[PDB]
Every structure is written in C-alpha cells, then in structure tokens.
Amino acid sequence: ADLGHQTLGSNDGWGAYSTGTTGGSKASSSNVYTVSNRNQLVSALGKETNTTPKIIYIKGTIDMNVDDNLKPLGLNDYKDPEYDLDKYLKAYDPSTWGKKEPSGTQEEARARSQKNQKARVMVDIPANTTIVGSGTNAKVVGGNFQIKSDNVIIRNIEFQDAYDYFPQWDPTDGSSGNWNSQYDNITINGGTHIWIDHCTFNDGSRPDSTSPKYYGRKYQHHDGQTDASNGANYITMSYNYYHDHDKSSIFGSSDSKTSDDGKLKITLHHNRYKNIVQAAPRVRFGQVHVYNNYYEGSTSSSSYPFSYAWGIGKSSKIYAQNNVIDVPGLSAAKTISVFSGGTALYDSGTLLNGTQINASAANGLSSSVGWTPSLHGSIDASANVKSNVINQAGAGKLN
C-alpha cells in the first residue's frame, strides 16, 4: 500500500495497542482528498463529526497564516486595535511592574490578538484520518495541528515555524521570567491511537536567533514541536527529524494533572534531534518507550545550545534503550534533567560521545520504572543508531 493507505504495524509501539492505529486506511473513494492550500485542507478535515475514514494527501507548501482568499497574514492583520508592543513592554517592565502577573489593558489586548491568529493557524484533526505528504516537498508552514480524536496517522510532512506573533510575558516563569508562546506543530490534546512518522519539525526561516531579547529574555515566538497532554494515550512517533528548535516534546503538561497517571503511553523511536535545546522528551507520569533515537548538538551553540535530552518529570516512567547522544563535553549526568517528583529511569545501551553510560545511575535514580515494553519492532545496536537515523529520519525520505 502507499503512504496514504498504510497502517501502523501491529507491533510498532504504543500506537498499536488495542484497536491500533489505522487512520483513514479504510476510506471510501469520496473521502480521499488532495490539498495544496489552507482552504482545501480545512475543507477536507471538516468538523469533529467528520469521522468517516479519510485520507488527505498534501501537495506542496501549505501556509496556514492566510485569509480565506489565501492572502498572507502577519502581525498587523492579527493585532487587536488596542495592542501595541511598545506599550506592552512599557506596561510590564519588571523595573516598574515588578513580578506580578501582567494584567490590564495591554495584556487583555495581547490575549485577544493571540486568539485572532489561533483562528487561522490551529486546526483540529478528526477521528480516523490519515494525512500524508505527497512527494518529498510537502510542507505545513505556521500551522498547529491538534488531535483530540482517536485513530490518526500523520506522515511525510515538513512542519515549519509554528509562530506566535504575540508571546506572553511571565515574570515568575523561572528566576528571571520568560516569554511563552502557544503554537506547537502538533498538539495531542487527549488524542489516542496516533502515529507520527517520517515528519520533519523545525523553526523554518525564523529561528530563535532572529528574535530579540526583552527584559533580558528571548522574545520566544515558538512553543513545542510534538506535545501531548490531557490523557493523550497510545502514540507512536517514529523516524521524525526534529531540528533547530528550543522546546521539542513535552508529554504531560502539569504536575497537578494526576489523571495523566496510567496514560501518556508513547513510543519514540528512530527520531533525530539536531540542535534541539531541551525536552526530547520531557515526561510527566507516562510509560514512555524511547529507543534508537539520535541526539546531536552543542552546549556552546549560538542559536540552539543543548541543555538536556530526557526530562525526568513528576512520576515519569521512561524506558530508554540504545539511544545515542553526541554533545561534546557533556557529562553522563547532564544528558538528562531531573525535576521534582522524578525518581526513576530505565536506560540501557545509552551511548554518549561514543562511550557507554548509565544516565539513570549517574543521577541517583531508581532503575525500576515498573514496566517493560512489549510493542516494539527490531532494536538496533547502539553502534548503528547514528547512521540509521541520519539516513532514514524525516520528511522526503520515502515519498
């Protein structure tokens, strides 16, 4: 079968659990679409009631920051009449505002502006849907696909630059505050039975090195690449190429969302993370299988310096096998970041700069995560992971 009609293999990660991930493979003739712009994509997807098996082939570049006549939209198109960046900056300057949460006119205007862009860039993917790139140049630019439904396949697409024109200042996000934006390339919001395979995720033509610092903090226009939240479950992400981006993959959005316990069952394999700063993945609660992934970066990079690969968040149950990390000068311990409530990590065959390490032991963590993955394909020797992943990961590698 072609990419449009293929299903997730019955052994291929958590996505294969129970009813598995078949997407729109069973689509009838009238439910197979070819789309080349935002209008056609939105028409094909329809509403949440569009649950018939459907296949959507993406042809070329789809820019999501466009109006109904496909005219490009920018800051001034989305801007609320009351919003002004200069006045926003002046209002919430820590020097005069202090560390209280931004409120009042400019913040309210910024929030409205953000909702204006959200209406264009964010689209929900309905149940029983396969979306695949045709050829080697299928792209979604500025878009944020959200999956709240069951049984969705996304393959062979380059996702670029999920860009938020209205980053929000949070003075208490970290010791010196932070700017936060809203759009991921893909957000799995309670979605189940999902396969994301052979996609590419990057910051397109607007990497973070092109954004200024305000209040000494990066004016961050991006959020996640592939995030999963709110009871998201039974997901396989394989052969994806994540590059040139800050916060990649956050699974479990809050320490307070204890209902995520027993969920966030995600398998990550054969993914490439190049010049990714952090969260690859950052996990709360979930039984996450991380195997045969390749990580490469520099702690001294001027654009996207490496911070950590795996985030051991609250009650996380990461099971890691034969992953390869290439970051000059990095210690075994610093391959991961351990957050409050994170106490356990199973990792075997981890290679750091060509040397076998034990990331869990290096961080004093328990080696027991209380599970062993049964749903997986063949496991590559760590020695072959770098080559296999560079060769095979990302969009334009099949077609």
Ligand X SMILES: O=C(O)[C@H]1O[C@H](O[C@@H]2[C@H](O)[C@@H](O)[C@@H](O[C@@H]3[C@H](O)[C@@H](O)[C@@H](O[C@@H]4[C@H](O)[C@@H](O)[C@@H](O[C@@H]5[C@H](O)[C@@H](O)[C@@H](O)O[C@@H]5C(=O)O)O[C@@H]4C(=O)O)O[C@@H]3C(=O)O)O[C@@H]2C(=O)O)[C@H](O)[C@@H](O)[C@H]1O
Stretch that binds ligand X, among 7-15, 60-68, 191-199, 245-253 (CB under 6 A): 245-253
Taking CB under 6 A as the rule, which mask of x and - marks residues 277-316 in contact with ligand X?
-----x----------------------------x-----
Q: Is 252 in the site for Ca ion (CB under 5 A)?
A: no
Task: Give the residue, chosen from 189, 303, 388, 392, that forms a contact with ligand X under the rule CB under 6 A.
Answer: 189
Binding map of ligand X across residues 347-386, x = CB under 6 A, - = no contact: ----------------------------------------
Termini Cα distance of the chain: 12
Cβ neighbours around 255 below 10 Å, total: 15
Q: Is 151 in the site for ligand X (CB under 6 A)?
A: no
**Can you tell me which of 43, 103, 210, 254 binds ligand X, judged by CB under 6 A?**
254
Q: Is 244 in the site for Ca ion (CB under 5 A)?
A: no
Pick the binder of ligand X from 134, 151, 253, 315 (CB under 6 A).
Answer: 253
> Please, what is the minimum distance in Å from the beta carbon of residue 208 to ligand X?
13
Tokens 């869990």, residue? 360
Cβ contacts of 97 within 8 Å, gap of 6 or more = 91, 171
What single DSSP character describes residue 231?
T
Choose the stretch contacting ligand X; rule: CB under 6 A; options: 8-16, 134-142, 248-256, 367-375.
248-256
Cβ proximity to ligand X, 84 vs 339, nearer residue: 339
Closest chain position to ligand X (CB): 253
Nearest to 388 by CA among 264, 288, 263, 239: 239
Residue type, 233: N
Does residue 182 touch ligand X according to CB under 6 A? Answer: yes
166 in Cβ contact with 113 (< 8 Å):
yes
What does the per-residue mask of binding to Ca ion show for 204-243, with x meaning CB under 5 A?
-------------------xx--x----------------
Which tokens sit at 197?
Answer: 């395979």
The residue with tokens 């290439």 is 326
Q: How many CA atoms lie within 13 A of 129 on its CB side?
A: 28
- Distances in Å between the Cα of 6 and the Cα atoms of 104, 134, 265 are 51, 14, 22
Closest of 43, 111, 126, 42 to residue 79, by C-alpha: 111
Site string for Ca ion, 147-176 (x = CB under 5 A): --------------------------x---
The gap from C-alpha 28 to its chain's centroid, in whole angstroms, comes to 31
One-letter amino acid at 257 equals K
Give residues in contact with Ca ion (CB under 5 A). 173, 180, 184, 223-224, 227
